[PDB]
Design a protein around this ligand. Structure first.
Ligand SMILES: *[C@@H]1O[C@H](CO)[C@@H](O)[C@H](O)[C@H]1O[C@@H]1O[C@@H](C)[C@H](O)[C@@H](O)[C@H]1O
Ligand SMILES: *[C@@H]1O[C@H](CO)[C@@H](O)[C@H](O)[C@H]1O[C@@H]1O[C@@H](C)[C@H](O)[C@@H](O)[C@H]1O
Ligand SMILES: *[C@H]1C[C@](C)(N)[C@@H](O)[C@H](C)O1
Ligand SMILES: *[C@H]1C[C@](C)(N)[C@@H](O)[C@H](C)O1
Lengths: 7, 7
């Protein structure tokens, strides 16, 4: 991962 | 709020 979210 | 990130 590395970005975040939440989708 | 309620969503996420990160910016
Ligand atoms: C990120 O979000 C997931 C759920 O989707 C959760 O299981 C992780 O523990 C969470 O990561 C933590 O919080 C983020 C802000 C930090 O960058 C990460 O190192 C971790 O402590
Ligand atoms: C962000 O949300 C995930 C999923 O609930 C959780 O695992 C992380 O602990 C949470 O990160 C915290 O809250 C955000 C808003 C802050 O930017 C981050 O540093 C951390 O405190
Ligand atoms: C993260 C938060 C959110 C965008 N409100 C939710 O719909 C998702 C499943 O998780
Ligand atoms: C959340 C994760 C990220 C997109 N890699 C970072 O650049 C931001 C400051 O925090």
């Amino acid at each position: 991962x590395x970005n975040x979210x939440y989708x």
